Subunit: 223 residues, 3 copies
Amino acid sequence: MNLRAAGPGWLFCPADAPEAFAAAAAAADVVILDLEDGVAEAQKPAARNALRDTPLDPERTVVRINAGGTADQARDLEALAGTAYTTVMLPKAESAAQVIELAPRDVIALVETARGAVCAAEIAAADPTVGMMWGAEDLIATLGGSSSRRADGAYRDVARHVRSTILLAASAFGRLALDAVHLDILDVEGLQEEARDAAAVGFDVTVCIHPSQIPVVRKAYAA
Amino acid sequence: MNLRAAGPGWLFCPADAPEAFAAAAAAADVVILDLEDGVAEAQKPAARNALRDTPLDPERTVVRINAGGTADQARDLEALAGTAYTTVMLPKAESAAQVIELAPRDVIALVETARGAVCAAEIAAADPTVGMMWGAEDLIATLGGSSSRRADGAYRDVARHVRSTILLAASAFGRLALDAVHLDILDVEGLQEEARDAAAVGFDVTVCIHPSQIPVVRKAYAA
Amino acid sequence: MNLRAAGPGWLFCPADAPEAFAAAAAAADVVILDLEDGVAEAQKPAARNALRDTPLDPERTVVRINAGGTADQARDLEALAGTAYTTVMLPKAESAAQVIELAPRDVIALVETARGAVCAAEIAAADPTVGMMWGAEDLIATLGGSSSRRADGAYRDVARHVRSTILLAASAFGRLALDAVHLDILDVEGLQEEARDAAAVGFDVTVCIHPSQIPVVRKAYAA
């Protein structure tokens, strides 16, 4: 894909909702059709069917598959066979090996565990990698914690640490850098603060979970 | 040891004070009998004797030995021979090699120097490692600095950086993560702030230097 | 050089201004004669001549050359041949290989890109390395960002992250650690805040761009 030529506003769309695919594509620069946590276990087969029969522009669409070694990932790659999509997003990305096993597809590695953070440079350097993202929710959950943000709403230090780690790793290897979702959709103030800062430090994209977040991201990245 | 099954409140007890061993054990989830900085040079031989003749439950006791390559460490491992203790804490932990040389004991690596921070993943990955701790005092001292905390009492950035480094390294390799001592014993407000945050981000333990700190730690880690 | 024996106040002096060399040397502990960004492209040949015909004490002078692989660097090393200088500062330092190729000179590696940050330990460990510095301006510029500082004037997180990275890498390998320039010359309050903190955490030097910054740095590092 010409990832950089596409704008900064990327939008998750659960793949079990094909009636929303066209609306997502019109709202966003890039849509991430989601086969992982956006879709309940029981509707994953239906999601994979929707992925096949309701296509989007593959120049502006990536598919978030399931994690390495899972039966779900294998089912996802089978469903992808029947599409035109070239680029996948790998959740819980933890090693170069997990990225390499996805060749010949392009891979956006989503680092959201300690092992992924520790191995970020190796992940970023892997040949299939075209982008790096981070996520604070599963980072804190897999660390054994309870909250990625403190009471005043700022990310805790370990999240801040991982954010910088992934920005540096991505940039060191010439990869797109994607900043984490702002989970509080109606908190447009916080999103604006994050996206302005992301743009300022060289993130290429801020990933969104609701179409209302796209204009705020696009404005933050204006220059 | 079943480290995780033991609670979050660990308590240093200088090994040259056997009259306090039973009181420490009753107050704490785990006692760290200390042969390093808790004990003056001249009383280290007496500490090693106390370690032998005044036993604690080895399921709930770890021994902090002296640093790699020191004559004191060699004397410590000799004294340990006559005990039932299985788990040691290695101060100034700086390489996998320093941990491996302690096999077949289990090792909690205490990272408190730049080299330890830089090599944290290697240390965490070493076969004997069961836990990682950090310390800001000796980190700043060995860096050549003067204060780990700024005037408003917050840790300086390099300390914050090392804290996250060790949390991630420990979690990446499935090790217990131990948060640093709160040196200002009577500052229970600061300890509560640190321990609540530690619990939130996935530390397993907050290490204490005074029995009064244990209830505050236990409450912070409640869930 | 006896780098540590020289004081904490280092001062950039563009090498195309030999009429200022003596004044810089009298004001500063160490002068960095600059052949890179301090000197416009068209005056670099003149700078290299000045470097030759207007000598400073080589015990108290380092030369900032141009980046690895550039034609300018090659011209710089040729000009250096005719001087007594032993120690160079390598901008945009990105690998051990870039440092090693400067042997047998001593090298202060200036990390100011993502790749340099990611490879900081390798850079620090390289045999010619005697010091590590960081720079936030080119870090943010090469990341693709727009501002190293947020609106309240604090460094953004990625800059803070790289600062700690370089401090740790330098200290882990026994190298001098140099803190970044305070670009707002008249902001002596901010410089004092930075230099006091730098001194506190174990930086050896704060690099300056104007002689007025030297007394503030010297006082901050007093103890």
